[PDB]
Amino acid sequence: AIIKEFMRFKVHMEGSVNGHEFEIEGEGEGRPYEGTQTAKLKVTKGGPLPFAWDILSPQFSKAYVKHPADIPDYLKLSFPEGFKWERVMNFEDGGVVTVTQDSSLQDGEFIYKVKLRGTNFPSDGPVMQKKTMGFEASSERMYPEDGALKGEIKQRLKLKDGGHYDAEVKTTYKAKKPVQLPGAYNVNIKLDITSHNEDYTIVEQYERAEGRHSTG
């Protein structure tokens, strides 16, 4: 079909965190049906970033989630038109991130456009002081609602000084054309930052994502 075994992507983010505006550009690739991918990102404006990269890392790809055959792969089916999503993240210390995204397919590649606004992070908190050390593996609980696919997750960021820093994330994913919605299931995700330069202006990431049954 139109999604191959191997697919490349291009991503653009504009964003702002606590007033600091930035842009990021990137490129990636992976195995949609295997649920694997990598990306190399660069900050093209407003670098070096005066906040933790970990609040950006999960915003850069839902077509690359391995699904068993009997769970409708709603986000794969949305193509070539693609899909949109809208995400709210509430961090435990009052930080808030909202994100919007458009995905489409152009000349055999995915094209992702992201906008992000983070606000109300305490200035001494672990985001503005760069004290996070990456994401624990997590599970997004998916379920259909009101003509769209919803995802909920509790994210846990590791802190450099021991301990964890949590967020509650809810996401609405909506296909540009009406396609087959799944029922309730789970997506296990591990996301690692595989390399970075000293100021996180060039970052590489790797993500593995797999759909699992919640019932039966």
PDB file of C-alpha atoms in Angstrom:
ATOM      1  CA  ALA A   1       0.000   0.000   0.000  1.00  0.00           C
ATOM      2  CA  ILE A   2       1.074   3.615   0.305  1.00  0.00           C
ATOM      3  CA  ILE A   3       2.909   3.068   3.618  1.00  0.00           C
ATOM      4  CA  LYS A   4       6.073   1.048   2.811  1.00  0.00           C
ATOM      5  CA  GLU A   5       8.294  -1.214   5.007  1.00  0.00           C
ATOM      6  CA  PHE A   6      10.742   1.690   5.208  1.00  0.00           C
ATOM      7  CA  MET A   7       9.599   5.349   5.274  1.00  0.00           C
ATOM      8  CA  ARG A   8      11.434   8.634   5.729  1.00  0.00           C
ATOM      9  CA  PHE A   9      10.107  11.774   7.354  1.00  0.00           C
ATOM     10  CA  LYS A  10      10.666  15.500   7.653  1.00  0.00           C
ATOM     11  CA  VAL A  11       9.686  17.589  10.667  1.00  0.00           C
ATOM     12  CA  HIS A  12       9.399  21.277  11.536  1.00  0.00           C
ATOM     13  CA  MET A  13       8.590  22.630  15.005  1.00  0.00           C
ATOM     14  CA  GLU A  14       7.901  26.159  16.021  1.00  0.00           C
ATOM     15  CA  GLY A  15       7.552  26.805  19.594  1.00  0.00           C
ATOM     16  CA  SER A  16       7.878  28.758  22.656  1.00  0.00           C
ATOM     17  CA  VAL A  17       8.661  27.730  26.212  1.00  0.00           C
ATOM     18  CA  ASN A  18       8.188  30.257  29.079  1.00  0.00           C
ATOM     19  CA  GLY A  19       8.436  33.020  26.427  1.00  0.00           C
ATOM     20  CA  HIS A  20      11.551  31.710  24.700  1.00  0.00           C
ATOM     21  CA  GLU A  21      10.793  31.201  20.987  1.00  0.00           C
ATOM     22  CA  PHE A  22      12.612  28.611  18.904  1.00  0.00           C
ATOM     23  CA  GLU A  23      12.458  26.535  15.772  1.00  0.00           C
ATOM     24  CA  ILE A  24      13.589  23.042  15.078  1.00  0.00           C
ATOM     25  CA  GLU A  25      14.029  21.195  11.802  1.00  0.00           C
ATOM     26  CA  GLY A  26      14.550  17.532  11.311  1.00  0.00           C
ATOM     27  CA  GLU A  27      14.641  14.350   9.442  1.00  0.00           C
ATOM     28  CA  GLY A  28      14.046  10.725  10.273  1.00  0.00           C
ATOM     29  CA  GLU A  29      13.335   7.255   9.124  1.00  0.00           C
ATOM     30  CA  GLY A  30      12.118   3.911  10.231  1.00  0.00           C
ATOM     31  CA  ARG A  31       9.973   0.793   9.886  1.00  0.00           C
ATOM     32  CA  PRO A  32       6.281   1.614  10.278  1.00  0.00           C
ATOM     33  CA  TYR A  33       5.039  -1.935  10.705  1.00  0.00           C
ATOM     34  CA  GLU A  34       7.959  -2.820  12.953  1.00  0.00           C
ATOM     35  CA  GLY A  35       7.195   0.158  15.186  1.00  0.00           C
ATOM     36  CA  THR A  36      10.751   1.593  15.054  1.00  0.00           C
ATOM     37  CA  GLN A  37      12.298   4.948  14.092  1.00  0.00           C
ATOM     38  CA  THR A  38      15.072   7.460  14.503  1.00  0.00           C
ATOM     39  CA  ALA A  39      15.405  11.149  13.906  1.00  0.00           C
ATOM     40  CA  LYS A  40      18.081  13.766  13.879  1.00  0.00           C
ATOM     41  CA  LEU A  41      16.907  17.199  14.999  1.00  0.00           C
ATOM     42  CA  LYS A  42      18.570  20.617  14.900  1.00  0.00           C
ATOM     43  CA  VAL A  43      17.662  23.878  16.503  1.00  0.00           C
ATOM     44  CA  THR A  44      17.584  26.483  13.711  1.00  0.00           C
ATOM     45  CA  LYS A  45      16.405  29.443  15.735  1.00  0.00           C
ATOM     46  CA  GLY A  46      16.705  30.458  19.313  1.00  0.00           C
ATOM     47  CA  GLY A  47      19.400  28.035  20.225  1.00  0.00           C
ATOM     48  CA  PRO A  48      20.881  27.082  22.491  1.00  0.00           C
ATOM     49  CA  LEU A  49      17.652  26.200  24.196  1.00  0.00           C
ATOM     50  CA  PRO A  50      17.391  27.539  27.731  1.00  0.00           C
ATOM     51  CA  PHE A  51      15.222  24.514  28.829  1.00  0.00           C
ATOM     52  CA  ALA A  52      15.344  20.681  29.018  1.00  0.00           C
ATOM     53  CA  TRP A  53      15.132  18.945  25.647  1.00  0.00           C
ATOM     54  CA  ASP A  54      12.934  16.202  27.262  1.00  0.00           C
ATOM     55  CA  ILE A  55       9.822  18.327  26.913  1.00  0.00           C
ATOM     56  CA  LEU A  56      10.315  18.397  23.162  1.00  0.00           C
ATOM     57  CA  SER A  57      11.355  14.780  22.593  1.00  0.00           C
ATOM     58  CA  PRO A  58       7.944  13.106  22.538  1.00  0.00           C
ATOM     59  CA  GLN A  59       6.486  15.645  20.040  1.00  0.00           C
ATOM     60  CA  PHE A  60       8.637  14.622  17.053  1.00  0.00           C
ATOM     61  CA  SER A  61       5.188  10.023  14.761  1.00  0.00           C
ATOM     62  CA  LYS A  62       2.248   7.806  15.274  1.00  0.00           C
ATOM     63  CA  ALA A  63       2.426   6.076  11.878  1.00  0.00           C
ATOM     64  CA  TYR A  64       5.393   4.058  13.167  1.00  0.00           C
ATOM     65  CA  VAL A  65       3.545   2.053  15.845  1.00  0.00           C
ATOM     66  CA  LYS A  66       3.477  -1.685  15.372  1.00  0.00           C
ATOM     67  CA  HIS A  67      -0.136  -2.978  15.574  1.00  0.00           C
ATOM     68  CA  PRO A  68      -1.341  -6.558  15.569  1.00  0.00           C
ATOM     69  CA  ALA A  69      -3.620  -7.279  12.595  1.00  0.00           C
ATOM     70  CA  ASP A  70      -6.816  -7.232  14.574  1.00  0.00           C
ATOM     71  CA  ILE A  71      -6.347  -3.745  16.011  1.00  0.00           C
ATOM     72  CA  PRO A  72      -7.337  -1.121  13.363  1.00  0.00           C
ATOM     73  CA  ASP A  73      -4.219   1.000  12.641  1.00  0.00           C
ATOM     74  CA  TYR A  74      -6.272   4.229  12.399  1.00  0.00           C
ATOM     75  CA  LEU A  75      -3.311   6.556  11.943  1.00  0.00           C
ATOM     76  CA  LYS A  76      -1.795   4.373   9.155  1.00  0.00           C
ATOM     77  CA  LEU A  77      -5.196   4.264   7.443  1.00  0.00           C
ATOM     78  CA  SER A  78      -5.510   8.042   7.452  1.00  0.00           C
ATOM     79  CA  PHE A  79      -2.934   8.396   4.710  1.00  0.00           C
ATOM     80  CA  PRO A  80      -2.280   9.735   2.221  1.00  0.00           C
ATOM     81  CA  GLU A  81      -4.281  12.728   3.529  1.00  0.00           C
ATOM     82  CA  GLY A  82      -2.953  12.037   6.999  1.00  0.00           C
ATOM     83  CA  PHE A  83      -4.018  13.235  10.415  1.00  0.00           C
ATOM     84  CA  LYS A  84      -3.845  15.922  13.049  1.00  0.00           C
ATOM     85  CA  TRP A  85      -3.401  15.901  16.793  1.00  0.00           C
ATOM     86  CA  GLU A  86      -3.729  18.143  19.743  1.00  0.00           C
ATOM     87  CA  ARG A  87      -2.026  17.454  23.054  1.00  0.00           C
ATOM     88  CA  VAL A  88      -2.171  18.916  26.582  1.00  0.00           C
ATOM     89  CA  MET A  89       0.592  18.077  29.111  1.00  0.00           C
ATOM     90  CA  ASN A  90       0.143  19.006  32.794  1.00  0.00           C
ATOM     91  CA  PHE A  91       3.357  18.772  34.768  1.00  0.00           C
ATOM     92  CA  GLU A  92       3.324  18.153  38.486  1.00  0.00           C
ATOM     93  CA  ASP A  93       4.928  21.549  39.410  1.00  0.00           C
ATOM     94  CA  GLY A  94       2.473  23.659  37.348  1.00  0.00           C
ATOM     95  CA  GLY A  95       4.269  23.596  33.962  1.00  0.00           C
ATOM     96  CA  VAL A  96       1.942  23.242  30.989  1.00  0.00           C
ATOM     97  CA  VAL A  97       2.615  22.249  27.347  1.00  0.00           C
ATOM     98  CA  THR A  98       0.129  22.389  24.528  1.00  0.00           C
ATOM     99  CA  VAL A  99       0.978  21.018  21.130  1.00  0.00           C
ATOM    100  CA  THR A 100      -0.604  20.829  17.728  1.00  0.00           C
ATOM    101  CA  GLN A 101       0.500  18.745  14.827  1.00  0.00           C
ATOM    102  CA  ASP A 102      -0.293  18.100  11.264  1.00  0.00           C
ATOM    103  CA  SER A 103       0.866  14.956   9.481  1.00  0.00           C
ATOM    104  CA  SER A 104       0.645  14.315   5.762  1.00  0.00           C
ATOM    105  CA  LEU A 105       2.304  12.322   2.986  1.00  0.00           C
ATOM    106  CA  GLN A 106       4.193  13.998   0.164  1.00  0.00           C
ATOM    107  CA  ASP A 107       6.314  12.215  -2.530  1.00  0.00           C
ATOM    108  CA  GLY A 108       6.621   8.996  -0.516  1.00  0.00           C
ATOM    109  CA  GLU A 109       7.626  10.800   2.713  1.00  0.00           C
ATOM    110  CA  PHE A 110       5.826  11.832   5.912  1.00  0.00           C
ATOM    111  CA  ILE A 111       5.675  15.526   6.569  1.00  0.00           C
ATOM    112  CA  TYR A 112       5.105  16.707  10.132  1.00  0.00           C
ATOM    113  CA  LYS A 113       4.437  20.268  11.214  1.00  0.00           C
ATOM    114  CA  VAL A 114       4.377  20.954  14.959  1.00  0.00           C
ATOM    115  CA  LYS A 115       3.504  23.957  17.105  1.00  0.00           C
ATOM    116  CA  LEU A 116       4.274  23.925  20.808  1.00  0.00           C
ATOM    117  CA  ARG A 117       3.628  26.335  23.707  1.00  0.00           C
ATOM    118  CA  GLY A 118       4.990  25.675  27.152  1.00  0.00           C
ATOM    119  CA  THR A 119       4.141  28.038  29.988  1.00  0.00           C
ATOM    120  CA  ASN A 120       4.298  28.363  33.766  1.00  0.00           C
ATOM    121  CA  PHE A 121       7.408  26.298  34.380  1.00  0.00           C
ATOM    122  CA  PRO A 122       8.950  27.398  37.626  1.00  0.00           C
ATOM    123  CA  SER A 123      12.214  29.119  36.953  1.00  0.00           C
ATOM    124  CA  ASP A 124      14.051  26.927  39.530  1.00  0.00           C
ATOM    125  CA  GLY A 125      12.193  23.788  38.381  1.00  0.00           C
ATOM    126  CA  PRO A 126      13.809  20.885  36.516  1.00  0.00           C
ATOM    127  CA  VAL A 127      12.770  21.975  33.049  1.00  0.00           C
ATOM    128  CA  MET A 128      14.151  25.546  33.134  1.00  0.00           C
ATOM    129  CA  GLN A 129      17.193  24.354  35.129  1.00  0.00           C
ATOM    130  CA  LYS A 130      17.863  21.344  32.843  1.00  0.00           C
ATOM    131  CA  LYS A 131      17.703  18.723  35.550  1.00  0.00           C
ATOM    132  CA  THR A 132      15.819  15.956  33.674  1.00  0.00           C
ATOM    133  CA  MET A 133      17.618  12.821  32.491  1.00  0.00           C
ATOM    134  CA  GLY A 134      15.179  11.264  29.928  1.00  0.00           C
ATOM    135  CA  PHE A 135      11.861   9.357  29.904  1.00  0.00           C
ATOM    136  CA  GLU A 136      10.990   6.088  31.626  1.00  0.00           C
ATOM    137  CA  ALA A 137       9.236   3.589  29.254  1.00  0.00           C
ATOM    138  CA  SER A 138       5.525   4.316  29.336  1.00  0.00           C
ATOM    139  CA  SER A 139       2.164   3.165  28.117  1.00  0.00           C
ATOM    140  CA  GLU A 140      -0.416   5.284  26.300  1.00  0.00           C
ATOM    141  CA  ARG A 141      -3.998   4.174  26.990  1.00  0.00           C
ATOM    142  CA  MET A 142      -5.926   4.625  23.717  1.00  0.00           C
ATOM    143  CA  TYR A 143      -9.669   4.759  23.248  1.00  0.00           C
ATOM    144  CA  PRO A 144     -12.159   6.080  20.635  1.00  0.00           C
ATOM    145  CA  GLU A 145     -14.200   9.131  21.504  1.00  0.00           C
ATOM    146  CA  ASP A 146     -16.435  11.493  19.534  1.00  0.00           C
ATOM    147  CA  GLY A 147     -15.145  10.516  16.082  1.00  0.00           C
ATOM    148  CA  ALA A 148     -11.490  10.621  17.096  1.00  0.00           C
ATOM    149  CA  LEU A 149      -8.776   8.543  18.836  1.00  0.00           C
ATOM    150  CA  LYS A 150      -7.769   9.586  22.326  1.00  0.00           C
ATOM    151  CA  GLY A 151      -4.518   8.717  24.143  1.00  0.00           C
ATOM    152  CA  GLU A 152      -3.704   9.176  27.819  1.00  0.00           C
ATOM    153  CA  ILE A 153      -0.359   8.754  29.472  1.00  0.00           C
ATOM    154  CA  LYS A 154       1.414   9.422  32.727  1.00  0.00           C
ATOM    155  CA  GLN A 155       4.964  10.425  31.735  1.00  0.00           C
ATOM    156  CA  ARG A 156       7.806  10.057  34.156  1.00  0.00           C
ATOM    157  CA  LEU A 157      10.988  11.990  33.604  1.00  0.00           C
ATOM    158  CA  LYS A 158      14.117  10.964  35.487  1.00  0.00           C
ATOM    159  CA  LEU A 159      15.812  13.746  37.484  1.00  0.00           C
ATOM    160  CA  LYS A 160      19.619  14.098  37.701  1.00  0.00           C
ATOM    161  CA  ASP A 161      19.447  14.244  41.473  1.00  0.00           C
ATOM    162  CA  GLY A 162      17.359  11.059  41.929  1.00  0.00           C
ATOM    163  CA  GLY A 163      13.597  10.858  41.645  1.00  0.00           C
ATOM    164  CA  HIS A 164      11.076  11.510  39.040  1.00  0.00           C
ATOM    165  CA  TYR A 165       9.140  14.350  37.585  1.00  0.00           C
ATOM    166  CA  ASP A 166       5.694  13.541  36.315  1.00  0.00           C
ATOM    167  CA  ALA A 167       3.225  14.760  33.804  1.00  0.00           C
ATOM    168  CA  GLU A 168      -0.365  13.842  32.741  1.00  0.00           C
ATOM    169  CA  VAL A 169      -0.784  13.889  28.978  1.00  0.00           C
ATOM    170  CA  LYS A 170      -3.932  13.665  26.943  1.00  0.00           C
ATOM    171  CA  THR A 171      -3.928  13.644  23.172  1.00  0.00           C
ATOM    172  CA  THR A 172      -6.600  13.823  20.503  1.00  0.00           C
ATOM    173  CA  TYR A 173      -5.658  12.221  17.198  1.00  0.00           C
ATOM    174  CA  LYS A 174      -8.000  12.859  14.248  1.00  0.00           C
ATOM    175  CA  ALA A 175      -7.798  11.501  10.716  1.00  0.00           C
ATOM    176  CA  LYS A 176      -8.346  13.896   7.885  1.00  0.00           C
ATOM    177  CA  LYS A 177     -10.762  11.336   6.363  1.00  0.00           C
ATOM    178  CA  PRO A 178     -13.255   9.168   8.191  1.00  0.00           C
ATOM    179  CA  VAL A 179     -11.500   5.803   8.760  1.00  0.00           C
ATOM    180  CA  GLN A 180     -11.846   2.799  10.991  1.00  0.00           C
ATOM    181  CA  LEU A 181     -11.470   3.628  14.716  1.00  0.00           C
ATOM    182  CA  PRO A 182     -10.142   0.909  17.004  1.00  0.00           C
ATOM    183  CA  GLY A 183     -11.511   0.164  20.397  1.00  0.00           C
ATOM    184  CA  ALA A 184      -9.625   0.543  23.696  1.00  0.00           C
ATOM    185  CA  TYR A 185      -5.990  -0.725  23.681  1.00  0.00           C
ATOM    186  CA  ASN A 186      -2.501   0.231  24.824  1.00  0.00           C
ATOM    187  CA  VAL A 187       0.665   1.440  23.179  1.00  0.00           C
ATOM    188  CA  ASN A 188       4.012   0.731  24.868  1.00  0.00           C
ATOM    189  CA  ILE A 189       6.698   3.260  24.045  1.00  0.00           C
ATOM    190  CA  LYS A 190      10.340   3.675  24.767  1.00  0.00           C
ATOM    191  CA  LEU A 191      12.033   6.850  23.646  1.00  0.00           C
ATOM    192  CA  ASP A 192      15.789   7.408  24.026  1.00  0.00           C
ATOM    193  CA  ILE A 193      18.036  10.350  23.147  1.00  0.00           C
ATOM    194  CA  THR A 194      20.884   8.517  21.445  1.00  0.00           C
ATOM    195  CA  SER A 195      23.310  11.471  20.897  1.00  0.00           C
ATOM    196  CA  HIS A 196      23.572  15.161  21.403  1.00  0.00           C
ATOM    197  CA  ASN A 197      26.126  17.861  21.219  1.00  0.00           C
ATOM    198  CA  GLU A 198      27.084  19.959  24.226  1.00  0.00           C
ATOM    199  CA  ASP A 199      24.228  22.460  23.999  1.00  0.00           C
ATOM    200  CA  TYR A 200      21.473  20.155  22.569  1.00  0.00           C
ATOM    201  CA  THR A 201      21.373  22.104  19.313  1.00  0.00           C
ATOM    202  CA  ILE A 202      21.822  18.793  17.451  1.00  0.00           C
ATOM    203  CA  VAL A 203      20.045  15.804  18.966  1.00  0.00           C
ATOM    204  CA  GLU A 204      19.373  12.241  17.766  1.00  0.00           C
ATOM    205  CA  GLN A 205      16.489  10.170  19.131  1.00  0.00           C
ATOM    206  CA  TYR A 206      15.243   6.575  18.797  1.00  0.00           C
ATOM    207  CA  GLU A 207      11.670   5.454  19.469  1.00  0.00           C
ATOM    208  CA  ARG A 208      10.043   1.993  19.684  1.00  0.00           C
ATOM    209  CA  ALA A 209       6.231   1.752  19.910  1.00  0.00           C
ATOM    210  CA  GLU A 210       3.980  -1.250  19.989  1.00  0.00           C
ATOM    211  CA  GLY A 211       0.212  -1.646  20.256  1.00  0.00           C
ATOM    212  CA  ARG A 212      -1.043  -4.295  22.756  1.00  0.00           C
ATOM    213  CA  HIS A 213      -4.565  -5.622  23.557  1.00  0.00           C
ATOM    214  CA  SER A 214      -6.217  -4.398  26.788  1.00  0.00           C
ATOM    215  CA  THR A 215      -8.897  -7.017  26.628  1.00  0.00           C
ATOM    216  CA  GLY A 216      -9.141 -10.568  25.260  1.00  0.00           C
TER     217      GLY A 216
END
